[PDB]
Structure formats: C-alpha cells, structure tokens
Design a binder for this molecule. Structure first.
Ligand SMILES: *[C@H]1O[C@H](CO)[C@@H](O)[C@H](O)[C@H]1NC(C)=O
Length: 304
C-alpha cells in the first residue's frame, strides 16, 4: 500500500482505478489545468508492488506544470499610434518605483524590466522608494484598485553600472514576485527569443505604454543602427534601433523597461525581443532597445 499521491501544483490528478484506494496496483493520471498551463511534454503513475508511485520513465518524481507564453485571447492584425483594448497586451506590467515604468511578465512569477528603472535618475535626489508593480488592466486607476504585487527579491544584471553615465550594456533586471499571479484572459506570459534573426531590418513589432491614463501602443519597424546616432556605435552588439521618421513623438510610446513585442509567424507566439532603455526623446522617430536574446541564458538561470 502506497500513500496519498503527491500534489502537483497548477495541476491535479484523477484515479483510473477504484478511487481512493492507494493500494498496490492502483493507477492515477496527472493533468495540468487548461488552458493557461501545460505539462512539460502522459503523466501516468501506478502504485508499484514495492510501495511507491512510479512512471516507467522518470518514476518517483511528479511531473511539472508550466504556463503558456505569448498567446493572448485577444491579438490585433502599415504603421500607427493608437489605443489599447483589454487583452491586446496581457503580459504588460506598469510600475511605480522612481516614476512611471513598465515591464513584461515572464512565466508565473517574474517580471522583466530595465535596470535603470530601479535607481533614481541622476540630477534627482536619493529617497525611500517602494517598488510598486501592477498588472491585469489597461487603465491606471484600475491597475491601482487591483493593487500592487509584493516583490520577493530583485536581481539586476551584473554588467549594468551605476557610476557609468551611458549604459549600452546590461540595462536589464528581473523582479521575483512573492506570490505567483492569477492567469486570466487579461494577464498572461510572453515568450523569450532564441533566433538571432529576430533582430532583422524592416521587422515589424509593437510597443505599448502609457503616455497619461489609458495604455496605448505603436507598430514600428526595426531600423538601421545608424538611425539612432544622435543618442551617442558599438551599440550594435548590445542593442538595436527601431522606428520611422513618420511616427514623430510616437516612436517613444514605450515607458522604460517596457517591452518590444514581435509575433513569430511560423509559430504565432509573441516574443519580447527588447527592453525600452534610458532614452528620452523620439524627435526624429527613432529609439533604441536592449537586445534581450543576448541575455536569455541569464534570464533562465535566474528563474531556475
Ligand atoms: C520614507 O520611508 C518610508 C517609505 O515607505 C516611509 O514610511 C517614511 O515615512 C519615509 N521616511 C520618513 C521616516 O519620513
């Protein structure tokens, strides 16, 4: 006689044998909660004669449920600078550390964001400063009504430098929420890039952000690193330019630590390819973002 099958968070299990009898020969089946989670690919265990539940492949250890990244229940389709509707950008995070910021949800309990966001901007005075993070809506007062999410710890890329006044490398950070969130149709994860070909000229992505009450967005193309010249050019190996002389002041729709979201057509997902950085004014219609892919192996090792 075995015991009470171990629990499987974000998932459960059913008995395929008389139910409630964990005696020798019993047999159960695990299943992650649909549709927001999915087993790590059928999760069948059976009380061996010895006295433990097993699975002829990884036996003795319970499967793992994960969430589905970049795949909202409300996507959207030239170029523009319009308003956002509940669902379009589900992985969107609005912060309020040292001023208004942004960030993208990763997985179940981590938020991606640019590092310079966590520190006051120079020429600004030092101060107490709670870290406020919100998600699950497009309006500001609403995101507030919902309340903020307590942060457990804060990991900032080791390359970033505070005394350096121009960080064209390592302007990325990860915040670990203290309690996972409640994945709804309005609040869901975004995927990470893996193909170097995600940073190709002309590629069309979307940027979203507040200004300032209702979250807006823009559909801009990846530009040539030359376009972003006044901001300084080895700024190519750690970042990328993007925008168009047409957009005007809307090329800077993003907030800061917000995200540059592209949608892979071969798999119709959604991947965060960049992080709006420390720039300040899209006068010509251009702006630079940090290359996320250069930091993927980092992101993952932090999330374990
Ligand atoms: C700033 O520190 C905390 C921030 O939450 C606040 O409670 C406090 O009143 C401020 N500093 C003081 C002691 O005035």
């Amino acid at each position: 006689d075995c015991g009470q099958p171990r629990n499987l968070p974000n998932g459960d299990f059913r008995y395929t044998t008389t139910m409630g009898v964990n005696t020798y020969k019993a047999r159960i089946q695990y299943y992650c909660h649909e549709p927001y989670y999915k087993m790590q690919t059928q999760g069948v265990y059976t009380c061996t004669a010895q006295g433990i539940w097993k699975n002829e492949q990884k036996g003795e250890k319970i499967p793992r449920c994960l969430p589905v990244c970049g795949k909202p229940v409300n996507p959207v389709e030239i170029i523009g600078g319009q308003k956002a509707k509940m669902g379009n950008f589900p992985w969107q995070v609005f912060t309020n550390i040292h001023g208004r910021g942004g960030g993208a949800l990763l997985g179940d309990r981590w938020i991606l964001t640019a590092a310079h966001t966590l520190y006051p901007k120079e020429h600004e005075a030092q101060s107490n400063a709670s870290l406020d993070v919100f998600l699950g809506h497009t309006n500001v007062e609403e995101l507030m009504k919902l309340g903020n999410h307590p942060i457990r710890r804060v990991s900032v890329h080791p390359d970033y430098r505070q005394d350096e006044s121009y960080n064209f490398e390592g302007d990325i950070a990860l915040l670990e929420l203290e309690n996972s969130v409640t994945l709804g149709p309005n609040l869901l994860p975004i995927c990470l890039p893996d193909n170097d070909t995600f940073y190709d000229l002309g590629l069309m992505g979307y940027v979203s952000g507040f200004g300032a009450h209702d979250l807006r967005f823009v559909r801009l193309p990846v530009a040539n690193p030359q376009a972003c010249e006044n901001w300084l050019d080895v700024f190519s190996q750690n970042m990328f330019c993007a925008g168009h002389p047409s957009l005007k002041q809307d090329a800077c729709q993003g907030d800061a630590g917000g995200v540059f979201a592209v949608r892979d057509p071969n798999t119709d997902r959604w991947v965060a390819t960049g992080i709006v950085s420390w720039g300040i004014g899209c006068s010509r219609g251009y702006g630079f973002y940090t290359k996320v892919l250069n930091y993927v192996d980092w992101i993952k090792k932090e999330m374990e």
